[PDB]
Design a protein around this nucleic acid. Sequence first.
RNA 1: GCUGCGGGAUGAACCGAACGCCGGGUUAAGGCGCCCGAUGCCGACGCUCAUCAGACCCCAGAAAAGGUGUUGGUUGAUAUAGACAGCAGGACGGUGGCCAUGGAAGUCGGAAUCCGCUAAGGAGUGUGUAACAACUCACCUGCCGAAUCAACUAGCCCUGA
Lengths: 195, 175, 175, 139
Amino acid sequence: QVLVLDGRGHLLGRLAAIVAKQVLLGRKVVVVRCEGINISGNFYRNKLKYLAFLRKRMNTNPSRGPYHFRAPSRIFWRTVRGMLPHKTKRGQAALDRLKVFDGIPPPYDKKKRMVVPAALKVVRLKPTRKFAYLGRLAHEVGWKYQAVTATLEEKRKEKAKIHYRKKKQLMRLRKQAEKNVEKKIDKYTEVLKTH
Amino acid sequence: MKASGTLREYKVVGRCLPTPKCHTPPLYRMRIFAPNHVVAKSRFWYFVSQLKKMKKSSGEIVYCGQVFEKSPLRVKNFGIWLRYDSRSGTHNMYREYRDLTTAGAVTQCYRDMGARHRARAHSIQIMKVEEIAASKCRRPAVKQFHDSKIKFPLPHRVLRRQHKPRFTTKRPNTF
Amino acid sequence: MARKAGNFYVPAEPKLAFVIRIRGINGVSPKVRKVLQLLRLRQIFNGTFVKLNKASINMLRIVEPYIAWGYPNLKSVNELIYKRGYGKINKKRIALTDNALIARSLGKYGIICMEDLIHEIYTVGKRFKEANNFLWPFKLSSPRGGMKKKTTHFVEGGDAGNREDQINRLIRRMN
Amino acid sequence: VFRRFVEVGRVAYVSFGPHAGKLVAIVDVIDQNRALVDGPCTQVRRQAMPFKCMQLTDFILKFPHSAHQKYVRQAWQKADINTKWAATRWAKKIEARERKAKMTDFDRFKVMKAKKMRNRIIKNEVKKLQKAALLKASP
RNA sequence: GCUGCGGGAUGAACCGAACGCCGGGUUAAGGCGCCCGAUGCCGACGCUCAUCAGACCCCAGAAAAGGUGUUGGUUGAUAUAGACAGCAGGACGGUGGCCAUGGAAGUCGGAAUCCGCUAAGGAGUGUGUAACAACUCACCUGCCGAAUCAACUAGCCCUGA
Ligand SMILES: [Mg+2]
Ligand SMILES: [Mg+2]
Ligand SMILES: [Mg+2]
Ligand SMILES: [Mg+2]
Ligand SMILES: [Mg+2]
Ligand SMILES: [Mg+2]
Ligand SMILES: [Mg+2]
Ligand SMILES: [Mg+2]
Ligand SMILES: [Mg+2]
Ligand SMILES: [Mg+2]
Ligand SMILES: [Mg+2]
């Protein structure tokens, strides 16, 4: 049904390719932590390209024409727009199925975030090559919302730390129960039939 | 030549036609590397036409044979002589390759001359192939592969592009 | 018999060659178009058996960029005669399907049956012209694995040229 | 860090290719990418295989440089890699994956009913352990 | 022109291939990250960092020239009769030689060109004080310790743009 994707350590083009392919099949995919999406190349190079993209505007009326978003979620959404056939009623429905969020929303705090392996920085890039943060690019150009998003992100990371101790305590309790007696009769059958 | 796939070593011998002006042609011999024996025969006609007064009509090929490796299980060192033609002018070249068989070493030679110097197979002419021993290699790369008790790990080994599912909670640790 | 004495040996250059036409129809010079009309290659992907001769090889050297020609093996002859054997009485190409058609229309030379027809095609006898005229040009489908670039010769990794034994692989892909 | 590395005389595992599930032994490195591997008792023939094609292990042997099949087999039977290789958790994990590939429907039914019974016992005993933890924390 | 169809995004000429209506299979030209059918092969080798990368005949832009930016190649020359760089010391005598005098006492210029001490000094590679003098270099020696230096050439990238 719904898919929740991490954005930490992912590449823009690879993640946009996989999302734009899997959204045409009907799986309602949502990319969360969009400010953490890495972009290969030098950061001055990437903001020079984005400054040229901002320079692209209609001279007769800048409103009626090229819209230029600064938030990284809307940057990724424009990247998926430029790849889906949005002028027809297939890519428009796919963009309606796609949702994008900066930071992490409260339902996506609870719902588990997937990590796509083929779109990873570590898999796709040599580690001696330069990179750039889309959130750093957005804070440098236009998107003035890093002081709120980073604060709420550290708040939910503290919430995750206060949940993980309880989860690890419950895991230690259930492994103490597995260390305890009178479960092995089914475990012999399980090991002989693929534990 | 296309040099498609791995190369093969062919011993091709050829001679002139029996003529009343000169019977018993000297039956020359070459060592042609080619993907198959038809390309070996044609490149043999090319080289013998450039060397001596021979063409396909006034000559014939006596024998064309596959040459198998004398020791495929031995990691050997091969020096290759090259008469490639660059964009400005042709040049002579000596290269070295550590590989198992002669056909594989000349295959690596064609692939590497296509990689670095942008030389097509139209321009590369293999002058001579010779197995060279240790302590005669001019190249520092092969000279530093010459190590007994050699130790190296495999740092940052990433693999399996989407053989695993495209969507997971994993985050693959390298090495 | 020659390697026990230490001497080489050359086999007989064969006198029969299968010719498939590779290239298209429009954009063809008349110098090669007339030779294709004489070799009955008027459409694309049709093939004929040609008795090799100096005049025939000098025709094939004219139409090298348009055909692929080689030496068919015994199954390469046999599958083309059995599977797609189409003769003609005067007009009206009929599938062979019986020995009576060959015994009635062609069997005026002791060649009444299909074993005689395959023998006359493979071992080129004195009545090869009647058998080649009786056989309609073999309509062949496109190959399974595809073709290599269709423009350069088989020496340069292409299709339009001489290959001398890989026409067996080509006829197993096409037939 | 870097506890494992290729070496003259190290056994290794093969993941990709026609020899998947077969142990090789590295003899010497050809050039940076492929190694002359050999198999004494694991049915794989002496050839050249890539380093990304193979998988590094932890057991070593004492091979001479560019040795033969006979001396590789003698060092293999001296080191006893087969029983020592079966006596690890790694081979048990690979064996469990092969047994999961060799499951059947009746086996999955038995696994699922034992899974229901074990999960009920786990649920009740973890609830009893946390009840005992609250009873310990109450004073 | 008189000509549809598949690629070149878009096209009169380009590359395949020519057209009655359809079912199945196969292929050319081309392509396989998404639009957009197909590499989601545990593809192989090597090159490339651009602060203006590059991406396929016609085809929609660019040269001469340059780079101690990296990758090969050629020609050579040095180095246990201890080099290359680094630190330290010497760098004279004939002779302020000779053509000059506005100076030349190596140092604007013209012609040349040896010997001794030698550890080694070039009748001197430059900086200067107008010149006379100080400084420095070739060359030599002390420590160090084993590879070093020079000129061309062509692949990518950069400047030229
Ligand atoms: Mg054409
Ligand atoms: Mg198929
Ligand atoms: Mg043409
Ligand atoms: Mg016309
Ligand atoms: Mg078109
Ligand atoms: Mg175009
Ligand atoms: Mg069809
Ligand atoms: Mg093609
Ligand atoms: Mg697709
Ligand atoms: Mg350069
Ligand atoms: Mg440029």
